[model samples]
Target: NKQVKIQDAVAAIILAEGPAGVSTTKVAKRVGIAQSNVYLYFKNKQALIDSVYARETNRILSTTDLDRLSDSTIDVTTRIRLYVQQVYDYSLANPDSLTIIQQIKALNGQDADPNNIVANLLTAAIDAKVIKQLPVSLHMGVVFSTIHTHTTNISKGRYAQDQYTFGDIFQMIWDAMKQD
Candidate 1:
């Protein structure tokens, strides 16, 4: 059997489909389990969102560890390249998840001080002087705009480059961000 439980996969599907589009009944039918079991793992919809948030948090953390950011082994510019590339790769692979993230941020409206791993990562990055002190809302606005813009372009078959436009565009942004 695959390592992930049936419910775990179903939960991811629900998130991608959005809170209104997917529900416990949807997950239950997908997994052949009773909808009540959805509540067993996640008490409610907010709890489900929290789980997704943590998953997204861990995904980024593993992709871009703060330790790796300051590893003297790599040049600083290369480090930033690796960081941005990882994020771009994650976004492309999980565009549906990216959509969920975009929607949730829009819904939350406020990036309240959080005790979660992702929030801690952001705070620590700022405190450690790894990244600029950009407001969380501003940061999220730029991030969501980036993901949505190019992703929608791809969805619409509007690639400007002849040879793999998505990768080219993603790398372009990464390199473009490097200031002298």
Candidate 2:
């Protein structure tokens, strides 16, 4: 129960307060465990953070098939929809994962890649005139940033109705990205 409590507390803390606020003392306090016991589960804050990050992202990262979405014949809109839908689902299910991943990437001092699989797929779509002609890097930046923003906003009280689903989000992104 202590381990689960630690995991839950860290996830809540990382989501609400950012990963930087996740300390062994705070974690132990939050979880009602002895501070010394926190060390038994996590050697350090980074180790606990990594565990939380991995637990949150493992399902989506492992199961996603970028290659299938990369198929040349698939319509760009369809591909983008599928990709966004999966991420949207993940975001809805584990809102913390998005922040965790972004935090980790920032901590590593790396920005988005221009030639990553998603970028490559977007590039092909641009080349085919299936999507608007924007630099791959900017395109990914806009899409991903929008998704994070919208997810966070919708998760909060800004969107009071909560009528929309991931499909709605996917369509919005597709509409913006799609070529006329």
Candidate 3:
């Protein structure tokens, strides 16, 4: 589990001090491993940061169960809402992971992949008139940016965590995407 330990240390450092704060020496000290041992698990600091990003992305995807978005039995609106709920709950439960993932996303200039399942779902929803007729990119920007902003603010104590109910937050996103 040394590799996992190292990644956890890197995530913690990134969350606390941003990517600039990460270093093999700092991670080694945080994980109680020798600096040289850090190199054994990762070739360099960039590799270490990449590993954490990969791990966090997997964690978020698995927890959110992206496959559920494809469930044809559910109404498109409900499916989207459920997916948003999963992300909101996950962010609340693992705020540090959210911050780390978001920071790494900025560091890498990451954006939604056009081929992503969510993108496909949004397209289908638009075609079916389940949501607004906006481009998939706009839908993505509204939903994800809203969630990220709210969750980050709540986590930073800028807003009381209970100031907005989950339904309240979801409704705001739904209103933006829902058909008139």
Candidate 4:
């Protein structure tokens, strides 16, 4: 579809050239359309950038199995494990999504609190004694930081493993948050 091609081109340019180089002219050039035609789909350059961010974030997140983490029948540790695994898997398969997410996070204003489904799950688990009581930040930090490191390091060819498995790291994170 033309719309998807335009959006993909925007993401490609953003990833390849950074957001600063993204303009209707560049997008139109990339998509082989007239500059004015780009405006027909997006009001402005910022609108196009915003749409790219939204589409990429939605595409990446829609693949995560977060709803399973919310199931009360599953133990909290298992839920956390599954959630972390999904994040790691997605990051490995779609490295560009991380850059898009970080850019969107920065665009959310430096003072804005970061909240998401995983944080909500952690909070509920803490309240239910499924995990030890601790600031939500620590839980988020441990999980996200570990995922960030593992993913980046693997890409850097610094991670040594016959195959990628998140169980050890997941256990380390769980140990930090698990009940005594």
Candidate 5:
């Protein structure tokens, strides 16, 4: 519980003031724990940030139905659509987590899907000639960046959420990646 509290405080600090503003001292104060106790849970600030990133990423992925995503019985196109819709809904529901994930990604330049599940799916689709023979990295960038941009804008009230249905967004992504 204490470790999670520390992580939550770190996430809040990042949202309020960005990563540079994070210090164990600030986290300890926010969590009402001793600064030394913070170190007991995390050896350093970067370690804390990594833990939060991992936790949040896992949270997002858990809701995306990994089992269904990897089930070969489903067509790759349908699977991709399911993955996009799930993640888009999650991002809209938890904008803070999305923002924190984006910040951590910028900080570490790390692949959010540490298990390479999404990459593997894209590779399989490419191999089957179901999608364009582009780099998996490019496919990932297109899908996720599109979801992130649209969700973020909708959450911020910059774009009306009702302006486009999930089908419209999924069609755009599918059209971009699907083989001609």
Candidate 6:
């Protein structure tokens, strides 16, 4: 859909500020169309925002590889560590998506939707005793904060000669969980 292509502009608006600053008029202007025409594809601004969120998450889900994490050992430590590593790698590789996620977060989840299984994964990990028991909100907060911090730092070209490796992150996370 040509309208889907406009999601980039919408997301750009979000990256600039947040969803609140975006409107059909702005989107149409960005696409060089009349505001009314923007509704031809989406019935409302919510629909358009939903599209942008889905597009961002879909692109993120598609670009990342998690096949190496097929171990069915029910080990939460392994799950959490590998999950972070996979996400860190993808975010480092596709800095744009990472930037978008970071922006969305900065927007206080204003542009977010009920997608991305980060919460579910973290809850499962905690429930399985891979880490100390914590509330879903706190766990996800810590987990994503950890991933976001490290990945963004790396994405910003902060790698030093003794920078953390993929293995190091996983190992350190595992050690932390064991301590917890």
Top model number, TM-score: 5
CA-lDDT, candidates in order: 0.55, 0.72, 0.81, 0.73, 0.82, 0.63
Off by over 4 Å in 4: 61-64, 110-116, 132-134, 160-164, 176-180
Candidate 3 collision pairs: none
- Per-model TM-score, in order, reads 0.61, 0.69, 0.82, 0.76, 0.87, 0.70
Off by over 4 Å in 6: 62-74, 102-121, 154-163, 171-179
Superior candidate under TM-score, 4 versus 6: 4
| lDDT for 96 (candidate 4) | 68
Clashing pairs in 4: none
What is the C-alpha local distance difference test score of candidate 1? 0.55
Residue-wise C-alpha lDDT for candidate 4, range 1-180, written one tens digit per residue: 877878988888877777776788889999998987888889888888889877765654443365675566877777777776776777777766777666655655550113366677888789889887989878776766776777777777886643556677677777877877
Instruction: Kindly report which residue pairs in candidate 5 clash with one another.
Output: none
Question: How big is the positional error of residue 110 in model 6, measured in Å on the Cα after superposition?
Answer: 9.5
State each candidate's clash count: 0, 0, 0, 0, 0, 0
Give residue 44's lDDT in candidate 2 (0 to 100).
92
lDDT of 3 at 103: 90
**Residues 23-127, model 5: lDDT tens digits:** 999999999989999998899889888888888888776634887777778888887777778777877777777789888778777432666667777888899
Q: Candidate 5, which segments miss by more than 4 Å at Cα?
A: 110-115
lDDT of 4 at 176: 78
- Arrange candidates by TM-score, highest first: which order? 5, 3, 4, 6, 2, 1
* Least accurate 10 contiguous residues by lDDT in model 3: 110-119
Q: Model 2, clash count?
A: 0
- Clash number for model 6? 0
